[PDB]
């Protein structure tokens, strides 16, 4: 057979694309954990993991497989609901939030003019997943990291939501693809540099990364909510924190560094002229290039997640809630009344072309 097998592929083709998409995200997340220790290792004059697989390539494999084969500790044998439900919400939200990220023009699973709302809505479901982990527990350390966890995520959600809305206001579109294409002539890091610092600061808090680390602070509250997590509930929750790191690093690339747009249009043009547009080999190269530009921009921020962790001491929680309210929020509302003013003054109010 050859004719009754081709249509089989055409009936399964769009499932292979999704698996290639999910594998694409998980490979980045899996090797983000290694890159965090490999990078933070070399800034501390260490080496980091280089013994598990040649040069430590199989380090995420060992850590995941080690925990996937640990004894799950349930309060009573049939309490799998309590342990898993917390991390499961967190993992689904951040895996569903990947559905709007485009790897090129139009290459996103969900394309709709409400992509920005879908992205902020999905993240807020993950916030609900985080606080549930401790709220079903009697351990004092685990239940400690709910009231402080709840407000930290609540407080820096306003700042992250408003920043996204200012960029959406400059293009007058809540579509991810339109925002990226709107940055052809200029990258929004040049006009809105302060928002990028505010976006990156807020992004750290939302993922509970240091220096906004007070939730899962080893010296303060041990593993935080994870001091009661082991085996699979630990990995799923740990994976969620690194899906968010990859996502929020990609989102900073999209909103301020042009997304998949090339660093040089000339180099992009010269490279693609070596392939014929009438053969599928041209489109693989463009897709590799366009995701390559995003990957390099995204990698720089996954680097900065680790880089700031190796350079800044952890910030005290009481001084952390007052930072986003008494410093960041007035600035963010000041700009949201500033950008419409400048645009109107020069008759440059945006329209979705």
């Amino acid at each position: 057979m050859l004719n009754n097998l081709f249509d089989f592929i055409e009936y399964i083709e769009y499932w292979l694309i999704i698996v290639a998409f999910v594998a694409s995200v998980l490979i980045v997340v899996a090797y983000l954990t290694v890159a965090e220790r490999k990078t933070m290792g070399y800034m501390q004059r260490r080496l980091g993991p280089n013994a598990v697989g040649y040069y430590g390539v199989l380090m995420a494999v060992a850590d995941a497989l080690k925990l996937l084969s640990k004894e799950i500790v349930l309060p009573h044998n049939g309490d799998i609901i309590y342990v898993m439900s917390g991390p499961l919400i967190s993992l689904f939200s951040v895996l569903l939030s990947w559905a709007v990220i485009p790897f090129g023009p139009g290459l996103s699973l969900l394309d709709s003019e409400y992509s920005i709302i879908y992205l902020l809505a999905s993240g807020s479901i993950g916030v609900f997943g985080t606080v549930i982990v401790g709220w079903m527990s009697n351990s004092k350390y685990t239940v400690l990291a709910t009231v402080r966890t709840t407000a930290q995520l609540i407080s820096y959600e306003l700042v992250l939501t408003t920043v996204v809305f200012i960029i959406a206001l400059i293009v007058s579109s809540l579509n991810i693809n339109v925002i990226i294409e709107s940055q052809y002539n200029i990258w929004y890091i040049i006009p809105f540099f302060p928002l990028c610092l505010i976006f990156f600061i807020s992004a750290l808090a939302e993922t509970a990364r240091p220096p906004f680390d007070n939730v899962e602070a080893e010296s303060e509250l041990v593993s935080g909510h994870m001091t009661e997590l082991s085996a699979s509930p630990f990995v799923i929750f740990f994976l969620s924190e690194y899906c968010s790191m990859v996502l929020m690093s990609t989102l900073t690339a999209i909103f301020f560094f042009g997304g998949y747009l090339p660093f040089s249009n000339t180099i992009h043009h010269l490279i693609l002229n070596l392939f014929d547009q009438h053969s599928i080999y041209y489109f693989i190269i463009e897709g590799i290039l366009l995701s390559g530009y995003l990957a390099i921009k995204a990698n720089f921020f996954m680097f900065s997640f680790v880089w700031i962790r190796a350079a800044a001491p952890r910030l005290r929680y009481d001084l952390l809630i007052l930072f986003c309210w008494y410093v960041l929020l007035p600035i963010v509302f000041a700009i949201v009344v500033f950008a419409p003013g400048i645009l109107y003054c020069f008759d440059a109010l945006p329209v979705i072309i």
Binding site: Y326, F333, A334, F338, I342, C345, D347, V351
Partner: protein
């Protein structure tokens, strides 16, 4: 008054300096925010010196000619 808190209606200039040193989180958020409405007020200056406003978009449906139907229209008939 080497360090006294200024009174706004007697020392307007020093009152802002006190807040531009001790409350940078308030003074420059107000300064940034006011730069928006200030720029809106300078819109008439731009009209007379830089360029006119663009023509408004044709976002009101099909442009209907303001006249009566043509009577001698022929061609493309059945």
């Amino acid at each position: 008054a080497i360090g006294d808190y200024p009174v706004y209606y007697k020392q307007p200039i020093r009152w802002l300096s006190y807040h531009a040193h001790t409350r940078p989180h308030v003074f420059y958020a107000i300064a940034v925010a006011a730069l928006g409405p200030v720029f809106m007020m300078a819109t008439p200056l731009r009209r007379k010196f830089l360029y006119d406003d663009h023509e408004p978009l044709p976002a009101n449906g099909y442009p209907l000619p303001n006249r009566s139907r043509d009577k001698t229209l022929t061609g493309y008939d059945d």
